[PDB]
Design a protein around this motif. Structure first.
Motif, PDB file in Angstrom:
ATOM      1  N   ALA A 126      11.905 -29.263 -39.971  1.00 45.99           N
ATOM      2  CA  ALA A 126      11.733 -27.870 -40.676  1.00 45.99           C
ATOM      3  C   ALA A 126      11.460 -26.739 -39.421  1.00 45.99           C
ATOM      4  O   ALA A 126      12.239 -25.698 -39.618  1.00 45.99           O
ATOM      5  N   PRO A 127      11.066 -26.848 -38.091  1.00 48.46           N
ATOM      6  CA  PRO A 127      11.078 -25.948 -37.170  1.00 48.46           C
ATOM      7  C   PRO A 127      12.575 -25.758 -36.552  1.00 48.46           C
ATOM      8  O   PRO A 127      13.354 -26.510 -36.748  1.00 48.46           O
ATOM      9  N   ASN A 128      12.579 -24.502 -36.190  1.00 47.80           N
ATOM     10  CA  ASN A 128      13.876 -24.134 -35.648  1.00 47.80           C
ATOM     11  C   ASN A 128      13.994 -23.021 -34.606  1.00 47.80           C
ATOM     12  O   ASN A 128      14.948 -22.662 -33.867  1.00 47.80           O
ATOM     13  N   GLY A 129      12.795 -22.573 -34.248  1.00 47.20           N
ATOM     14  CA  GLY A 129      12.613 -21.486 -33.265  1.00 47.20           C
ATOM     15  C   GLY A 129      13.346 -20.190 -33.737  1.00 47.20           C
ATOM     16  O   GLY A 129      14.233 -19.728 -32.860  1.00 47.20           O
ATOM     17  N   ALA A 130      12.984 -19.658 -34.723  1.00 45.19           N
ATOM     18  CA  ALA A 130      13.611 -18.485 -34.893  1.00 45.19           C
ATOM     19  C   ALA A 130      13.419 -17.286 -34.123  1.00 45.19           C
ATOM     20  O   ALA A 130      14.495 -16.720 -33.612  1.00 45.19           O
ATOM     21  N   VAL A 131      12.285 -17.102 -33.370  1.00 44.64           N
ATOM     22  CA  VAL A 131      11.959 -16.188 -32.441  1.00 44.64           C
ATOM     23  C   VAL A 131      11.370 -16.935 -31.202  1.00 44.64           C
ATOM     24  O   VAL A 131      10.208 -17.742 -31.432  1.00 44.64           O
ATOM     25  N   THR A 132      11.792 -16.766 -30.091  1.00 44.80           N
ATOM     26  CA  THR A 132      11.158 -17.467 -28.755  1.00 44.80           C
ATOM     27  C   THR A 132      10.741 -19.044 -29.119  1.00 44.80           C
ATOM     28  O   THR A 132      11.143 -19.322 -30.269  1.00 44.80           O
ATOM     29  N   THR A 133      10.287 -19.576 -28.111  1.00 44.24           N
ATOM     30  CA  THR A 133      10.262 -20.992 -28.290  1.00 44.24           C
ATOM     31  C   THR A 133      11.203 -21.852 -28.805  1.00 44.24           C
ATOM     32  O   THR A 133      11.822 -21.686 -29.850  1.00 44.24           O
ATOM     33  N   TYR A 134      11.970 -22.717 -28.021  1.00 48.49           N
ATOM     34  CA  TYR A 134      13.138 -23.358 -28.229  1.00 48.49           C
ATOM     35  C   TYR A 134      13.136 -24.737 -27.658  1.00 48.49           C
ATOM     36  O   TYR A 134      12.345 -24.935 -26.610  1.00 48.49           O
ATOM     37  N   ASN A 135      13.974 -25.639 -28.315  1.00 49.90           N
ATOM     38  CA  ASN A 135      14.021 -27.080 -27.606  1.00 49.90           C
ATOM     39  C   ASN A 135      12.385 -27.495 -27.535  1.00 49.90           C
ATOM     40  O   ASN A 135      12.207 -28.423 -26.789  1.00 49.90           O
ATOM     41  N   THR A 136      11.501 -27.193 -28.574  1.00 51.37           N
ATOM     42  CA  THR A 136      10.312 -27.694 -28.777  1.00 51.37           C
ATOM     43  C   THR A 136      10.204 -29.125 -28.903  1.00 51.37           C
ATOM     44  O   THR A 136       9.208 -29.958 -28.490  1.00 51.37           O
ATOM     45  N   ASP A 137      11.048 -29.796 -29.558  1.00 53.10           N
ATOM     46  CA  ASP A 137      11.378 -31.297 -30.187  1.00 53.10           C
ATOM     47  C   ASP A 137      12.302 -31.985 -29.370  1.00 53.10           C
ATOM     48  O   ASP A 137      13.425 -32.029 -29.910  1.00 53.10           O
ATOM     49  N   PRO A 138      12.155 -32.362 -28.188  1.00 57.54           N
ATOM     50  CA  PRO A 138      13.263 -33.372 -27.536  1.00 57.54           C
ATOM     51  C   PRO A 138      13.094 -34.640 -27.953  1.00 57.54           C
ATOM     52  O   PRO A 138      14.145 -35.460 -27.486  1.00 57.54           O
ATOM     53  N   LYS A 139      12.477 -35.067 -28.788  1.00 60.02           N
ATOM     54  CA  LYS A 139      12.417 -36.567 -29.324  1.00 60.02           C
ATOM     55  C   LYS A 139      13.575 -36.697 -30.227  1.00 60.02           C
ATOM     56  O   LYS A 139      14.028 -35.858 -31.100  1.00 60.02           O
ATOM     57  N   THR A 140      13.985 -37.912 -30.137  1.00 58.70           N
ATOM     58  CA  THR A 140      15.273 -38.331 -31.004  1.00 58.70           C
ATOM     59  C   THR A 140      15.007 -38.422 -32.228  1.00 58.70           C
ATOM     60  O   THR A 140      13.812 -38.957 -32.789  1.00 58.70           O
ATOM     61  N   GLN A 141      15.518 -38.016 -33.428  1.00 60.21           N
ATOM     62  CA  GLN A 141      15.446 -37.996 -34.962  1.00 60.21           C
ATOM     63  C   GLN A 141      16.710 -38.621 -35.366  1.00 60.21           C
ATOM     64  O   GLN A 141      17.903 -38.419 -35.283  1.00 60.21           O
ATOM     65  N   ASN A 142      16.304 -39.856 -36.012  1.00 59.72           N
ATOM     66  CA  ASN A 142      17.296 -40.571 -36.963  1.00 59.72           C
ATOM     67  C   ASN A 142      17.967 -39.737 -37.754  1.00 59.72           C
ATOM     68  O   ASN A 142      19.452 -39.753 -38.078  1.00 59.72           O
TER      69      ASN A 142
END
Length: 238
Positions: free
Chosen positions: A164-180
């Protein structure tokens, strides 16, 4: 094909396997405690008698490459004679128990793939005189798709909670974990394996063949079924 030779159809049937369970016990110091035949019930679900082991392999033999196809047939569907209400749902017999499945047990079995088409390319080598080594690979397909395609759009009414998260404003690449991120739900798994053996013929009509059926090498030896039914095989070619 300047000459007819002996190229053409042949039929194969594999068999062997061996086992030794408490089929025949040797009681004596414990005195006789068994019945006349001891009818099997709760101890054993059934086994044997149902679904023997047809598995038929047929193909065409060409000095070099060989095409083979394996059919299992039977998809739990009882077509029976074209008639309606052939069997009576209601029965006078009190005995029934359609399902013996037990809870807190979850017995292991097979449901990933049942009755499916199998095609593999095996090679017969005219390198030798009386016996050719066999080597090839398997490609297994089965019914898994019905419609040609769904829809052009991939937008779903339901919101995917996976990302759901996409970092619309500031904060990016918050989730570096692999997602199937699984899309379509299809239990029907595709299957790959290998086939090998050696045949010693009296003539191409009668040959003794050591056959081995094995699965594809994946992440460590986590394969459930092993040889299942392979070791010796007899095949006939005019």
């Amino acid at each position: 094909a300047s000459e007819d030779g002996g190229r053409g159809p042949y039929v194969q049937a594999d068999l062997a396997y061996a086992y030794e369970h408490i089929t025949h016990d040797y009681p004596e110091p414990t005195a006789p405690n068994k019945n006349k035949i001891s009818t099997v019930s709760d101890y054993f679900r059934n086994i044997r008698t149902r679904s023997v082991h047809p598995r038929v392999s047929v193909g065409y033999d060409f000095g070099g490459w060989r095409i083979a196809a394996d059919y299992a047939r039977y998809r739990k569907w009882n077509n029976n004679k074209y008639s309606v209400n052939i069997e009576n749902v209601r029965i006078r017999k009190e005995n029934g128990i359609r399902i013996d499945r037990k809870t807190e047990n979850q017995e292991n079995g097979t449901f990933h793939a049942v009755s499916s088409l199998g095609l593999s390319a095996i090679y017969d080598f005219q390198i030798n005189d009386k016996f050719k080594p066999y080597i090839g690979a398997r490609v297994a397909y089965g019914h898994v798709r019905h419609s040609i395609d769904s829809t052009k759009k991939t937008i779903e009414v339901t919101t995917v909670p996976s990302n759901a998260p996409n970092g619309a404003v500031t904060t990016y690449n918050t989730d570096p974990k692999t997602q199937n991120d699984y899309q379509s739900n299809s239990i029907r798994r595709v299957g790959l394996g290998v086939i090998a053996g050696v045949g010693f013929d009296i003539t191409p009509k009668l040959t003794l063949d050591a056959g081995y059926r094995y699965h594809n090498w994946g992440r460590l030896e986590n394969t459930r079924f092993k040889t299942h039914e392979a070791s010796l095989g007899v095949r006939y070619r005019f």
